[PDB]
Amino acid sequence: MRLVQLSRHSIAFPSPEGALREPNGLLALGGDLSPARLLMAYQRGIFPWFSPGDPILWWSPDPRAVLWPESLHISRSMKRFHKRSPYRVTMNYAFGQVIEGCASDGTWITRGVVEAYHRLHELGHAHSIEVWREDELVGGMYGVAQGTLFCGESMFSRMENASKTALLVFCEEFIGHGGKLIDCQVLNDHTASLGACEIPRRDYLNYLNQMRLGRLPNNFWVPRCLFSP
């Protein structure tokens, strides 16, 4: 259309300020899902999002949905449930099973996307949070790190409050160690109930430019247990 067709031979992107207003944030088309290109996209406030059979579409919406971790809304019923939680939460124990659980929920997460994000996980840039009921994976979430900003991709839940448990535990661990913001891309009723809000894209890009240079502790993303029953 009037979108920039990307090079199959370079990973540059047009500035997000140039995205379309309708559909909100559509910025470029094509390219590939190579690691360097995905990392360049996130670094600049862009993410791929397209349905099976579509060309790759890249986006940077205005406003941008974000979740300040200290503003996660946890209901009193959830507070009571978590006090007696039947779950164990871990980080980076089973990225493959987590993205698979999201995709089997997650129609935009095709085989190519799964492979692309698993590559990012192996390269140390994409991370999963797993929720277990004994030895059964019952929920989780994954995303891409950008310094002290975490870009949420998807989550899944196969047992009551499982995904909520992942987010609650992750937010506590993240904020306690220096994390500052979780990107949610677009607001919807679920994440809104969890406390997500909208900020102008300009402000989001400004937070990103500062935070991508920030660092969490050296071993913050090493596979480990975060919460036990």
Side-chain angles (χ1 to χ4, degrees), residues 102-163:
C102 293
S104 64
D105 182 309
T107 62
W108 55 277
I109 314 179
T110 69
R111 169 165 291 162
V113 171
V114 171
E115 300 176 335
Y117 285 77
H118 189 83
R119 290 190 291 267
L120 283 188
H121 170 64
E122 295 204 314
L123 292 167
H125 293 287
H127 308 287
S128 53
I129 297 299
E130 297 84 31
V131 182
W132 310 87
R133 163 69 98 144
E134 281 164 38
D135 65 336
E136 179 180 353
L137 178 65
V138 299
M141 54 173 320
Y142 73 98
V144 178
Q146 284 294 296
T148 55
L149 161 76
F150 189 75
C151 297
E153 292 285 311
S154 193
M155 63 184 17
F156 81 104
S157 192
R158 285 172 171 167
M159 277 208 83
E160 178 177 45
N161 300 322
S163 61

Side-chain angles (χ1 to χ4, degrees), residues 61-138:
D62 183 13
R64 184 73 170 229
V66 304
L67 166 68
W68 290 103
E70 69 271 34
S71 293
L72 176 68
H73 182 68
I74 298 297
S75 69
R76 60 175 186 230
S77 289
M78 179 61 197
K79 294 283 192 178
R80 297 195 65 176
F81 179 95
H82 190 62
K83 183 184 165 190
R84 313 172 184 169
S85 187
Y87 308 131
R88 168 172 86 275
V89 179
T90 59
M91 171 198 268
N92 284 326
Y93 267 36
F95 187 96
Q97 289 187 67
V98 169
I99 187 166
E100 271 313 319
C102 293
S104 64
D105 182 309
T107 62
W108 55 277
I109 314 179
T110 69
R111 169 165 291 162
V113 171
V114 171
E115 300 176 335
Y117 285 77
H118 189 83
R119 290 190 291 267
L120 283 188
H121 170 64
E122 295 204 314
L123 292 167
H125 293 287
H127 308 287
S128 53
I129 297 299
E130 297 84 31
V131 182
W132 310 87
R133 163 69 98 144
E134 281 164 38
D135 65 336
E136 179 180 353
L137 178 65
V138 299

